Every structure is written in structure tokens, then in C-alpha cells.
Design brief:
part of a larger assembly; 3 chains; A: mainly beta; 2 helices; B: mainly beta; 7-stranded mixed beta sheet; 4-stranded antiparallel beta sheet; binds a molecule of 3 linked components (NAG-NAG-BMA); Spike protein S1 (chain A); viral protein; SARS-CoV-2 spike protein sybody
């Protein structure tokens, strides 16, 4: 998508793994604000709306929480205390045709400053003098749709860094897309601590002899001590016994 | 506060040479990237040459490599644009560009090659 | 119209297996021997929860809409021929709303009763199947409603409206139950504590 039409796409209820993105051998000036880039995959947060653009890479450092300029004035603005990540990396081989890739024209003029996270779309030309333009372009019309010069012989500051906006907001909203959570193997017949799917604790973990309905995840008994669990990757039912203790 | 003007235009024939300039005020060109764009009749605006802000690497587009040369002077705060080996495809209106806070577009110069 | 709800509206409050114990709890519950609003086919309010106990031979009723204003100002929980569409979308209905014969999910001789519950931003889906035959009213049998799905919206829903051979609507308010779990892990009997002093 372009800067006039970067959509607020609601990709939800799936997983977008980020650990394959760090080993892409491509990322240049990636900076995840608020939270660290390392723990993006284990802990997640709601409002997982996504955006994309190839911004011209001369002023990537103008995009920051509380930093204005040209890109932060007329393209896309970040508010103070940003939770989320914008990842900038080059796109030299594919977003560069011969003779200039003029498939992404961009807004050069707006009357006011852009609101943070505002997708701006308009047709009308800039108002800078007092005389209105008659449709025919004159000396004070100032046609906002300028062309990025995207040629293969441009340098690294002139070539577009591709940016994706995985914006993170807080609402009364479902946390729909999170990263992957790794799992180890299963230990049996051992006084051991466990980290199952939601529930952790200590005990001796055995094979079962009971059965469940297809909707329970674990089970308790009289006076509510947890003595059962279901494992999620094996489709089996697993029992809990307390560890060996007593007096001497 | 940034004012850009263009000078050094004229009319040449096939096989001529010319020299353009862009005098600047209010910003240093050794801290920002200077670019040049042209505008031919019947065509859209396209980039000609640029100098990076470090001043080390200069770049030219696909049809204008090997013949054109852009150079800068830090003391006069003016960037010079050299024409060599001119063809009638280069008949255009030339502008200099910089992004210092906002973008500033000059009045341009006229270069006619025939 | 109104009719008596003999022993209906019980559900598992959580996903915890319990064997042969008489667990007691208090939650948002349908009272035993209450009167539901029977309609024979209608905006209905939503105080805290609804017990929905419709029967139809083919389920011509497929959609019912939650919201505060029920217009473009908010769920549309609708079924179709092979799927269901649920989404929170500000939408519309005309002066004669009917079906012409932020989520996605893929799904008389029938009695498909459901109960809906409202706490802590969460809305939960409970159901049973009931293959027995009675055309007059809701029957004398007993059934416990198992959970299906949970999803947060954080919206204070005030009323609803169903769309399309009858449906039954009752309401939920907190009292205390006793549940009779069996060996196989299902609820076989229930006691409303505040019904009569024998049950107290
Ligand atoms: C969660 O993931 C695990 C692993 O991806 C799934 O376990 C897999 O289950 C299938 C069916 O039970 C196994 O296929 C069978 O394998 C046996 C011998 O291994 C073979 O005799 C059969 O002919 C058949 O191919 C599969 O091997 C097993 N994978 C692993 C790595 O253990 C599990 O089903 C997933 N759970 C859900 C709910 O999808």
C-alpha cells in the first residue's frame, strides 16, 4: 500500500512469529519501543492492527515517539510513549524498476500537522496563497502528489526502507495475534515441576485411568486439589500425585 | 526561512555544455542531502543527480550516468550542477530539492537542448 | 404468554472435572420454577443474562443481535447453511427484519437450548442438543449446559433482538446452587438453595 492508502488491516486470530524475522539477514534500523525486541514472541498484547509502506529512507530517524520533521508531519506520526515496533529494512532489488519506480507518489503538502495514526487520503491541492486555483495549475497551486525517485543507482539513504507498523494499542479488545510459545517434551513418573498450557505447579505426574468429556482441560477432586490435567499436543489425559514427604 | 534559487541557465545545441547552481540560505548543505529534479515537456518530474549529506558518495540515475557531475561548495553554501554531452532528451526545467524540516522548492532554471 | 421452567438453566461454571462430589457455588443462575416469556412465532431487554430455549424443526431462526442501540452507532451472531458468522459490527435492519430464504469462526424433534452470561467483559457460549419430542412446552427433563467459546468485547449490552417455531426467554440473577456431579463428570441434578426451605 501507498502513503495515501495504507490500510488499517485487521488480521486477527492467527499467529505472526517474529523469531524468523530476526534471522532474515535483512533488518537494518529496527527499534521496538516500550518493550524489548527480544521478548516480542512470548508475551503479547491486544490491538494487533497492522500497516505497511515503503518510506523514502532519508529521514527514518524522524520517526520516533515525540520527534517531528517531514515524514512525521506529512506521512505518518508516532505519539509519545509508543508501544509497538516499526521495522525499517531496504527493498533495493524489487521496489526499483528501470527509469524510476513512480508507482508510489506521495503527499508533499498538508494544511495542518498530521494526527498520530491517521491514514490520510485526499485529492485537493495545497492552499498557500489567498487566490484559489481555477483547476489549471499555476504559481500558487502547489500540486502535492510529488514523485519519489526510486532508481537502482540510488544510495542506501536514497533507496526506500520498507516499514511495517505493528501498532499496539490498549483497549477493551481481544488479544488476537501473538507470537509462538515453545514447548519442551513430557516427563513422567518423577517428582517434578511442570509448566503446562496455562497452569504450573509441582508433583508426581503419572498415566491416567479415567476419561474426560472433550471440553475439560484439567480436573480437581473433593476440597479442590488439582489431581488431573490434559496435555495439548498428545491428546492424552495425565494425573497428578503429590511428592514424597513425611516426618522422620 | 530556507530560500532556494537557481541560476546558470541557457540554450545549448547538441554537443554543448552548461553549468547550473543552487544558492541556499538558512541551512548547511554538509548536514543535509541535496537533490536535483528536472521537468521535460510532455513528461513528469524525475531525479537527475544528488550528493549525500556526508559529501562522500554522489549518485546519478540510469539515463544520466557517466556524463553528468554534481559538486558542492560548503563555504558559499551553493551546489554546482555540470552539464556535459547533452542530448535533446535533456530539454527540461531543473529544480533543486532539500528536506530541512519541510520541503522547499525554488523558482527553477530553464535548460533547452536542441 | 408465560410458562413454568421446571428444572432448566444449569451450567458448568468452569472447566473443572469433579467426580461424585456435591459441589455448592453461587453464580448467575436461572431460578428453578420461574416463568419465562414464551413467544409463538420482538425486542426483549437484557438485564444480566438470558436463557434461550427455542425449538424448531429446521431452525429458521438463525440470528440474534446484541448491542446498546442495535444500529450503526454490537454483535451479529448469525448462522448460515454451512457456517456461522459472528462479528462485532455496527449494522442495520429494516422495518421488517427477516432472513431471506471483529472475529470469524467456522462451525419437536430438536430442542436447542442455550444460555448466555455477562461478567468481566466476557461472553460465553453454552448449549445442549435434547433429542426428545414434545410440541407443547419445554419438557420435564434435566440437562446441564457445557461451554463452547469465550471472547471479550467490553461492551455494556442493554437489550437484544432475535431474527428468523417458537422461542423461550428467561433471565439470570445471582443465587446459590448445589451441583450433583457423577462418576463420569457431568451434572446430574441441581438444587437452587433459595427456592424452598427443603432445598435450603
Ligand atoms: C499437536 O502437535 C503434535 C505434533 O505436531 C501432534 O501429534 C501428532 O499426532 C499424529 C496423530 O496422532 C501422529 O501421527 C501418527 O504417528 C504415528 C507414530 O508417530 C504413526 O504410527 C501414524 O501412522 C500417524 O502418522 C504424529 O506422529 C504426532 N506427531 C508428533 C511429533 O508426535 C498432535 O496431534 C497435535 N494436536 C492437535 C490437536 O492437532
Amino acid at each position: 500500500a501507498s502513503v495515501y492508502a495504507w490500510n488499517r488491516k485487521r488480521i486477527s486470530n492467527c499467529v505472526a512469529d517474529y523469531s524468523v524475522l530476526y534471522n532474515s539477514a535483512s533488518f537494518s534500523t529496527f527499534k521496538c519501543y516500550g518493550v524489548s525486541p527480544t521478548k516480542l514472541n512470548d508475551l503479547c498484547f491486544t490491538n494487533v492492527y497492522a500497516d505497511s509502506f515503503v518510506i523514502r529512507g532519508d529521514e527514518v530517524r524522524q520517526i520516533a515517539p515525540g520527534q517531528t520533521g517531514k515524514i512525521a508531519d506529512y506521512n505518518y506520526k508516532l505519539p509519545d510513549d509508543f508501544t509497538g515496533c516499526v521495522i525499517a529494512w531496504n527493498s533495493n532489488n524489487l521496489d526499483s524498476k528501470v527509469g524510476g519506480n513512480y508507482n508510489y507518489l506521495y503527499r508533499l503538502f498538508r494544511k495542518s500537522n498530521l494526527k498520530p495514526f491517521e491514514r490520510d487520503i485526499s485529492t485537493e491541492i495545497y492552499q498557500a496563497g489567498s487566490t484559489p486555483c481555477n483547476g489549471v495549475e499555476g504559481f500558487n497551486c502547489y500540486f502535492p502528489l510529488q514523485s519519489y525517485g526510486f532508481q537502482p543507482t540510488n544510495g542506501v539513504g536514497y533507496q526506500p526502507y520498507r516499514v511495517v507498523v505493528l501498532s499496539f494499542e490498549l483497549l477493551h479488545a481481544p488479544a488476537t495475534v501473538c507470537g509462538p510459545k515453545k514447548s519442551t517434551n513430557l516427563v513422567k513418573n518423577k517428582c517434578v515441576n511442570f509448566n503446562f498450557n496455562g497452569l504450573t505447579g509441582t508433583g508426581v505426574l503419572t498415566e491416567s485411568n479415567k476419561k474426560f468429556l472433550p471440553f475439560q482441560q484439567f480436573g480437581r477432586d473433593i476440597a479442590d486439589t488439582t489431581d488431573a490435567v490434559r496435555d495439548p499436543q498428545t491428546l492424552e489425559i495425565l494425573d497428578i500425585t503429590p511428592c514424597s514427604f513425611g516426618g522422620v | 526561512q530556507v530560500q532556494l534559487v537557481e541560476s546558470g541557465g541557457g540554450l545549448v545545441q547538441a554537443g554543448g555544455s552548461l553549468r547550473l547552481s543552487c544558492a541556499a540560505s538558512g541551512f548547511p548543505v554538509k548536514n543535509f542531502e541535496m537533490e536535483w529534479y528536472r521537468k521535460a515537456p510532455g513528461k513528469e518530474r524525475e531525479w537527475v543527480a544528488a550528493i549525500q549529506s556526508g559529501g562522500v558518495e554522489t549518485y546519478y540515475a540510469d539515463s544520466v550516468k557517466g556524463r553528468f557531475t554534481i559538486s558542492r561548495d560548503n563555504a558559499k553554501n551553493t551546489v554546482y550542477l555540470q552539464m556535459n554531452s547533452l542530448k535533446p532528451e535533456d530539454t527540461a526545467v531543473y529544480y533543486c530539492f532539500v528536506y530541512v524540516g519541510r520541503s522547499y522548492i525554488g523558482q527553477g532554471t530553464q535548460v533547452t537542448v536542441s | 404468554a408465560y410458562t413454568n421452567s421446571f428444572t432448566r438453566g444449569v451450567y458448568y461454571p468452569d472447566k473443572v472435572f469433579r467426580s461424585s462430589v456435591l459441589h455448592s457455588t453461587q453464580d448467575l443462575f436461572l431460578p428453578f420454577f420461574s416463568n419465562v416469556t414464551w413467544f409463538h412465532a420482538p425486542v426483549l431487554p437484557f438485564n444480566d443474562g438470558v436463557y434461550f430455549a427455542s425449538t424448531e424443526k429446521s431452525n429458521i431462526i438463525r440470528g440474534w443481535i446484541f448491542g446498546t442501540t442495535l444500529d450503526s452507532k454490537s454483535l451479529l451472531i448469525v448462522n448460515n447453511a454451512t457456517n456461522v458468522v459472528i462479528k462485532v459490527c455496527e449494522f442495520q435492519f429494516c422495518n421488517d427484519p427477516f432472513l431471506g430464504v471483529t472475529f470469524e469462526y467456522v462451525s419437536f424433534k430438536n430442542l436447542r437450548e442455550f444460555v448466555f452470561k455477562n461478567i468481566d467483559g466476557y461472553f460465553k457460549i453454552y448449549s445442549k442438543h435434547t433429542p426428545i419430542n414434545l410440541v407443547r412446552d419445554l419438557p420435564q427433563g434435566f440437562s446441564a449446559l457445557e461451554p463452547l467459546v469465550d471472547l471479550p468485547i467490553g461492551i455494556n449490552i442493554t437489550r437484544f433482538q432475535t431474527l428468523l417455531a417458537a422461542y423461550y426467554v428467561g433471565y439470570l440473577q445471582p443465587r446459590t446452587f448445589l451441583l450433583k456431579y457423577n462418576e463420569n463428570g457431568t451434572i446430574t441434578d441441581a438444587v437452587d438453595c433459595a427456592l424452598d426451605p427443603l432445598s435450603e
